[PDB]
Design a binder for this molecule. Sequence first.
Ligand code: HEM
Length: 110
Amino acid sequence: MVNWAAVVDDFYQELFKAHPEYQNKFGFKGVALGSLKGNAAYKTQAGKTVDYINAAIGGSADAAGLASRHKGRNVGSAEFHNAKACLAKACSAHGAPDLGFAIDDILSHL
Ligand code: HEM
C-alpha cells in the first residue's frame, strides 16, 4: 500500500522548513525538525493527518469540519495554499498520487 505515513513525515519536514512558525501552534512546538519522529505529540498528530488522507481517499472525510477546526486555530486559506505546495513535494518523492484535490476540498470551506 502507499506509504502515507512516510509521505506525511516528508510533508511536515517541508512545511516547517518553509514555515517554521507554523510549528508553534502544535504540541511539539520547539522540537528540532530532525527529531520529530521521537516526539509523542508529533506521533499523534502525524497519525491523524495520515488518517485524514485515508479518509479523503476513502470518501468519509469531513472537509468542512477540518476547515472549521483549522479556522479555530487561526489557520486559513494562506496556510493551506502553502501546505498544498509542501504536500505535492512529499507525494512526488514517494511516487504517491498528488493530494491537491483533497486540499482544494478543504480550501472550498476556508
Ligand atoms: C495538508 C494540509 C493539512 C492537513 C491534511 C491537516 C490535517 C489535520 C488533522 C487531521 C488534524 C486533527 C484534527 C482533529 O483532531 O479533529 C489537524 C490539526 C491541526 N492542524 Fe492541520 N492539517 C493541514 C495543514 C495545516 C497547516 C498548514 C497548519 C498550520 C499551522 C495546521 C495546523 C494545525 C493545528 C495547530 C492542529 C491542532 C493540533 C493540536 O490539536 O495540537 N494544519 N490537522
